[PDB]
Design an enzyme around this catalytic site. Structure first.
Site, PDB file in Angstrom:
ATOM      1  CG  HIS A  78      -0.502   0.161   2.688  1.00  0.00           C
ATOM      2  ND1 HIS A  78      -0.033  -0.447   3.392  1.00  0.00           N
ATOM      3  CD2 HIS A  78      -0.285   1.475   3.260  1.00  0.00           C
ATOM      4  CE1 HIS A  78       0.348   0.035   4.732  1.00  0.00           C
ATOM      5  NE2 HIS A  78       0.335   1.259   4.534  1.00  0.00           N
ATOM      6  CG  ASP A 127       0.328  -3.912   2.608  1.00  0.00           C
ATOM      7  OD1 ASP A 127       0.672  -3.388   1.504  1.00  0.00           O
ATOM      8  OD2 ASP A 127      -0.115  -3.354   3.680  1.00  0.00           O
ATOM      9  N   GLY A 130       2.688   6.578   8.868  1.00  0.00           N
ATOM     10  CA  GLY A 130       3.973   7.181   8.826  1.00  0.00           C
ATOM     11  C   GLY A 130       4.866   5.876   8.918  1.00  0.00           C
ATOM     12  CB  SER A 135       2.902   2.184   6.177  1.00  0.00           C
ATOM     13  OG  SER A 135       1.331   2.399   6.766  1.00  0.00           O
ATOM     14  N   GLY A 136       4.944   0.105   6.277  1.00  0.00           N
ATOM     15  CA  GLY A 136       6.108  -0.431   5.602  1.00  0.00           C
ATOM     16  C   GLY A 136       7.456  -0.937   6.154  1.00  0.00           C
TER      17      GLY A 136
HETATM   18 MG   LIG Z   1       8.485   2.238   9.575  1.00  0.00          MG
END
Ligand SMILES: [Mg+2]
Ligand SMILES: [Ca+2]
Length: 223
Positions: free
Chosen positions: A40, A84, A175, A177-178
């Site tokens: 995402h 994801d 912030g 995410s990933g």
């Molecule tokens: Mg991170």
């Protein structure tokens, strides 16, 4: 990251910041030429920033390399966030040193109860907005699939696991995410989604990397 602490400059050497003129997601370095993040977080025009601590100050240990290609999982579903995960190849190989290191992929999945380290430059308030400039860390245990499924009925698949505190107070947030969830020296999760941040009975949900190791290995060797 809410209820976490300042990691300390370069103590999470495999942490990457994806930038498209500003930091929008985190990621993990798996080897000199590849990074894994969340699907995402996909954007065209990504620059990978390695060796960062304060993302608004060039402190001397950064390497800014553009992405040559991005590969989102063949089965990523943006509506349920199932699968994801995405791979990003760097235009040039990074120079690994003490401050920039890769993280190992898991040989097996981690058990509920295992403590992990979650890191990122995401929001630090459950109710509010405060974006930090230095990397924040959070130790959190993997929760049982049963407590994860009761929190999110009909929304957790076998490609996701929950980590956190059901009491609330400590969690990943936007912030983040990933970014990485490392347990026992292996990358076991990717910050994916949750319900708000650090709310009671709403732990964060992570992509379960142990289910994607063959896909990752195959993909990086053919690209
Ligand atoms: Mg991170
Ligand atoms: Ca910096």
């Amino acid at each position: 990251i809410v209820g976490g602490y300042t990691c300390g400059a370069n103590t999470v050497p495999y942490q990457v910041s994806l930038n498209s003129g500003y930091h929008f997601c985190g990621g993990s370095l798996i080897n000199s030429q590849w990074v894994v993040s969340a699907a995402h977080c996909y954007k065209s025009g990504i620059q990978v920033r390695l060796g960062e601590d304060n993302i608004n100050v060039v402190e001397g240990n950064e390497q800014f390399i553009s992405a040559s290609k991005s590969i989102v999982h063949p089965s990523y579903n943006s509506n349920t966030l199932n699968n994801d995960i995405m791979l990003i190849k760097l235009k040039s190989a990074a120079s690994l040193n003490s401050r920039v290191a890769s993280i190992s992929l898991p040989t097996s999945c981690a058990s509920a109860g295992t403590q992990c380290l979650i890191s990122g430059w995401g929001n630090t308030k459950s109710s509010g907005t405060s974006y930090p400039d230095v990397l924040k860390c959070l130790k959190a245990p993997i929760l049982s699939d049963s407590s994860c499924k009761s929190a999110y009925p009909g929304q957790i698949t076998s490609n996701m696991f929950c980590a956190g505190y059901l009491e609330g107070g400590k969690d990943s947030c936007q912030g983040d995410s990933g970014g990485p969830v490392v347990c026992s020296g292996k990358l076991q999760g990717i910050v994916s989604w949750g319900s708000g941040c650090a709310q009671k009975n709403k732990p964060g949900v992570y992509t379960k990397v142990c289910n994607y190791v063959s896909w990752i290995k195959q993909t990086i060797a053919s690209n």
